[PDB]
Design a binder for this molecule. Structure first.
Ligand SMILES: Cc1cc2nc3c(=O)[nH]c(=O)nc-3n(C[C@H](O)[C@H](O)[C@H](O)COP(=O)(O)O)c2cc1C
Length: 109
């Protein structure tokens, strides 16, 4: 889904850096690709983000399972939005986790 907001992260590098951010992710978050690359996606969180939901994401990553959650995130300018976030593990030919894809399916409402 090239036309959506998504990032691809590399679990095989320290702290799951973003290695690709789609045009839609730039549009949603207001950050530049240069401001995003190599970061962990948690930079989108802020004071109003529910930690119980952050824990659910941790668990999904630990267990390498697909999941969907809703949580408050923040654009570069500090604007709050509800993010319906879908996380999808991608495995290589040998069954080993290779990427995690995160789609911000809906940004607010
Ligand atoms: C592919 C992928 C995409 C993610 N996208 C978001 C996102 O859009 N917003 C967000 O708040 N966290 C997102 N996260 C979650 C954080 O990167 C992080 O995994 C989460 O905050 C739990 O880890 P922590 O407790 O170490 O922060 C994403 C994670 C992955 C692997």
């Amino acid at each position: 889904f090239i036309e959506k907001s998504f990032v691809i992260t590399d679990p095989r590098l320290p702290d799951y850096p973003i290695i690709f951010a789609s045009d839609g992710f730039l549009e949603l978050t207001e950050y530049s690709r240069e401001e995003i690359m190599g970061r962990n996606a948690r930079f989108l969180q802020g004071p109003e983000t529910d930690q119980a939901t952050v824990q659910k994401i941790r668990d999904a990553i630990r267990d390498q399972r697909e999941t969907t959650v809703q949580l408050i995130n923040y654009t570069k300018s500090g604007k709050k939005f509800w993010n319906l976030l879908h996380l999808q593990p991608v495995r290589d030919r040998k069954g080993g986790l290779q990427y995690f894809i995160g789609v911000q399916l809906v940004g607010s409402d």
